[PDB]
Amino acid sequence: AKSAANKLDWAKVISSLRITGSTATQLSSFKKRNDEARRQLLELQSQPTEVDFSHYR
Amino acid sequence: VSTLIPPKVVSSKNIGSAPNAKRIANVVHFYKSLPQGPAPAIKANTRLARYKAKYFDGDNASGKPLWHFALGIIAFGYSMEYYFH
Structure with missing residues (x-):
């Protein structure tokens, strides 16, 4: 689902003809970008909630 | 947000600013007009209009109507001078 959203967002960014002179939509763009970066960081750095007592205890 | x-x-x-100002000017200038040479109104014969559609037409309007008018004027003036002189 994120792939199509990124595709359309980037296509809109690169196809701006009468969509220039903006101040806050780019801010929301970086907000979404850093939100996705935090998503990826959380998935790659998922610590183990339960204690791994099978091998650690 | x-x-x-x-x-x-x-x-x-x-x-x-200018294009929207001239949009109203150009939209109606081409709306209510003749398509191509409609209503020539060439036909006219009222002595003055007969001259208009016979010799005084603007297609040529050469010196020939002027020469004909001068000939008529001098023809009338000959009789006028015979009456007077």
């Missing part, structure tokens, strides 16, 4: 909306805000935004 909502993002700006250029293509969503076009109701108040027009094409620059």
